[PDB]
């Protein structure tokens, strides 16, 4: 954990009012009314927080992937359903998330580690749909993601349709 | 194919001076001193040109992939070399290419055709390197490098070349 999560929550609220770039651990400490030494027990760097954010999404996705309701869906609907939970999780703060990602731009240290996260995630979603070519799905997951970022529609309606279509189009072929 | 190619060149130059969005077929016609009826034999739509542009890259890549020199390089160097030929090809007009891609953004029909292009390309490069890397890793890399290359203002895309080299290398070792 509840303390690790309260950090992330705090980090993320802060970024909202101001921006991500503007967020320091000094301020997280300040908001939570605790010492910077406390915070650094959990997080020694600002990056480490991004990790946590994306791991929070990955776990919402995991809870879903084992619900009895999930095994009921179709292979197609399954992939679409996981990706959406993921993006809904992140959606709790879409602008901040976007900021986090724009942030590692033009960041080899932050960039290489994401590549690997994407592959695991893509492979995991693909395996999580049992009980489509890797690139295709990757390409789709990537594009949906980047599209989702700026999708200012409610509930990301536009993203949910976009994903549905590419996944379907692709399947048929 | 000299007439088809002259269209593309023309299309692409015009875009440079103005923008891609601004580019009309009649203008291409006007620029080449031929009739719009003549242009439309080759291209009935503006998209069709984007296709030809990206096919032009793929074929540079193909000519490379069968040069005797290519069969000398290592698996790693091989993929880096082809991707670079592809981006150099596009680099003849980086800003136009960028515009072409930004263009189909937020064009559902245009997006569907591309995803497939990416896959063949990725799978083609991967195969082209024998006589590996997980498909998603290499995809994720080819995508990222691409988008990074777009706004790499350095000379010869030095920055992109190094960027690609590193990710391909780091990824291989793991």
What crossing angle do the helices spanning A157-172 and A134-149 adopt, rounded to 10°?
A: 160
The rounded distance, in Å, linking the Cα atoms of B94 and B16 is: 9
Q: Is A33 an 8 Å CB contact of chain B?
A: no
Q: Is A107 an 8 Å CB contact of chain B?
A: no
Question: A97 near A149, Cβ under 8 Å?
Answer: yes
For B1-174, the fitting CATH number among 1.10.357.10, 3.30.365.10, 3.10.50.40, 3.40.50.970 is 1.10.357.10
The rounded distance, in Å, linking the Cα atoms of B43 and A71 is: 48
The rounded distance, in Å, linking the Cα atoms of B53 and B23 is: 14
On chain A, the residues whose CB falls within 8 A of the CB of B134 are 119, 123, 134
Question: Which of A106, A112, A123 is nearest residue B136 as measured by Cβ atoms?
Answer: A123
Are the beta carbons of B163 and A108 separated by less than 8 Å? yes
3 state SS of A77: helix
| Resolution of the experimental model, in Å, one decimal | 2.8
Look up residue A134 and give its two tokens: 């890797």
The rounded distance, in Å, linking the Cα atoms of B56 and B63 is: 11
* Cα nearest neighbour of A108 on chain B: B163
Phi/psi region, residue B81 (left: phi>0; alpha: psi -120 to 50; beta: rest), is alpha
Would you list the domain boundaries of chain B?
Answer: 1-174
Question: B11 near B49, Cβ under 8 Å?
Answer: yes
The rounded distance, in Å, linking the Cα atoms of A144 and B21 is: 24
Q: Which residues have a Cβ under 8 Å from the Cβ of A62 and sit 6 or more positions away?
A: none
Report the half-sphere exposure of A144 (CA within 13 A, side-chain side). Answer: 27
Are the beta carbons of A112 and B166 separated by less than 8 Å? yes
| Chains A–B, number of C-beta pairs less than 8 Å apart | 79
Tokens 């950090």 correspond to A7
Question: B78 near B128, Cβ under 8 Å?
Answer: yes
B22 exposure class (CB count in 10 Å sphere: 0-12, 13-18, 19+): exposed
DSSP state of A31: H
Q: Is A152 an 8 Å CB contact of chain B?
A: no
For the domain bounded by A1-173, which CATH number is listed? 1.10.357.10
Residue B20 has phi, psi (to 5 degrees) of: -70, -60
Instruction: Give buried/exposed letters for A159-169 (b at 16+ CB in 10 A, else e).
Output: bbebbeebbeb
Are the beta carbons of B148 and A106 separated by less than 8 Å? yes
DSSP state of A160: H
């Amino acid at each position: 954990d509840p303390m690790r999560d309260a950090i992330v929550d705090t980090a993320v609220e802060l970024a909202a009012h101001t921006s991500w770039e503007a967020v320091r651990l000094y301020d997280i400490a300040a908001r939570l009314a605790v010492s910077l030494d406390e915070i650094r027990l959990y997080f020694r760097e600002k990056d480490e927080l991004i990790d946590a954010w994306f791991d929070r999404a990955d776990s919402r996705m995991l809870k879903e992937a084992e619900s009895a309701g999930f095994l009921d869906l179709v292979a197609s609907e399954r992939i679409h359903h996981l990706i959406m939970i993921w993006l809904d999780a992140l959606a709790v703060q879409r602008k901040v998330t976007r900021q986090m990602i724009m942030s590692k731009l033009e960041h080899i240290h932050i960039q290489i580690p994401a590549v690997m996260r994407v592959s695991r995630t893509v492979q995991w979603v693909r395996e999580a749909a049992q009980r489509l070519e890797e690139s295709t799905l990757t390409t789709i997951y990537l594009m949906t993601f980047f599209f989702w970022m700026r999708d200012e529609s409610e509930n990301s309606r536009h993203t949910r349709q976009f994903l549905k279509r590419h996944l379907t189009m692709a399947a048929w072929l």
